[model samples]
Target: MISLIAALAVDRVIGMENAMPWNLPADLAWFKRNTLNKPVIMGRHTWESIGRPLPGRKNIILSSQPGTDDRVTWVKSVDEAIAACGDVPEIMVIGGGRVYEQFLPKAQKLYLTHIDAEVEGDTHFPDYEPDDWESVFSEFHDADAQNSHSYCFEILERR
Candidate 1:
């Protein structure tokens, strides 16, 4: 199945000045545990945000360019990414705005971390409309005992 994974505020704000505004180790751990060993597709900007290919996972960066490195397989379209992923057990679309918008319609599942607070950011997730998806699961985390933010993990399935 194809999935989109991201963290955003109530306003759907994802980043500020091209960087994540909050840090949640628990969330990171959750993401790593769930997506480890899976095929991940992202845009050039998203790849830049990550800095390097995550170890132990297949990284596919979608760009209009034509060069492949040992770290990432470059593709220009979502269809190409899907093909690059092949029959991998699962595939994930990790994003930085543009990539998410490009892959949203093709994504079958969505793994989103919804923060309780609103962050003033320029980059945001596309509007969350019920007509577009069904919230299949949701789990709330209290103000992390270790961190100041409270969040919920929302699993949505495209209708």
Candidate 2:
């Protein structure tokens, strides 16, 4: 099962200078809870932004350079990353724009956290057609002390 997970802003911005624009604790919690125990794939920049490999999940990096330690696996391309995973069920494509664009057409589902604000960012998620997907799950959360922006978590299944 190939699914792309992202916390994108109203203008489809996923990143700002290689980092996420906002911090939504609940959204982060939801992301970790769902993607935990799953094999994950990401672009080199995304991996770099994260600083270290996330614990308890396989970190497969699609990069030109190879990983130095056993904590992460490095691959050259998207196809190589897919081939690297051995039928474990779901591989979350956590991203920068380039990787997300590559995987969007091939993905079966999307775990999107829609931030309710327009942010000016250097990176953005690929523009996708809403009609091509069906929202299987959705929950809206109001802005609070812990989270800066109101957001909605929507799980969309490919139509």
Candidate 3:
């Protein structure tokens, strides 16, 4: 299975630059814990955003460029990333905008944190209409409780 995970604002902005525009400790922790031990596929920009490989997970960076660090398997295409994931039960498609757009069609699931605020940004989450996906689960997290904007955690599956 392949999945897309991201946090977005009311206007659907995902990032101002390459990094996430906002920080939610709980959400980040949840993401890390859930993705641990899994193979993750990301574009070159996304890999650069993180600076280095995340510990405990197999990181595969997709780039047309060759010979990156030894820790990351540099793939030239989406199919190459899939091929490298061999025997892994699931692969997480982590991203920046272009990367997410490329993998969106094949994604079986999406984990989104819908923040109740908006910000100016250069990058955005893929535009998704309700008709495109079915919400399988949702829960709200109030701002006061989380020390951030109120948000909803939604799990969606493609119809």
| Whole-model lDDT values for every prediction | 0.84, 0.90, 0.85
Instruction: State the weakest 10-residue window (summed lDDT) of model 1.
Output: 65-74
Residue-level lDDT tens digits of model 3 in 17-46: 777777777778868976899999888887
TM-scores, all candidates, are 0.91, 0.96, 0.93
Residue-wise C-alpha lDDT for candidate 1, range 1-159, written one tens digit per residue: 889899998688988887888888778887897789998888887787878888888899888987557667988888888999989767988887988887787778999998887689988886656788999999988886675799898899988
What residue pairs are clashing in model 3? Answer: none
Q: What's the true lDDT of residue 129 in model 2?
A: 92
For residues 91-144, write the lDDT of model 2, one tens digit per residue. Answer: 899887999999999999999998998889999889999899999999999999
lDDT of 3: 0.85
Tell me the TM-score of model 3. 0.93
Question: For this target, which candidate reaches the highest lDDT against the unseen true structure?
Answer: 2
Off by over 4 Å in 3: none
Ranking by lDDT: 2, 3, 1
Q: What are the per-model C-alpha RMSD values against the true structure?
A: 1.6, 1.1, 1.4
| Candidate 1: stretches off by over 4 Å | none
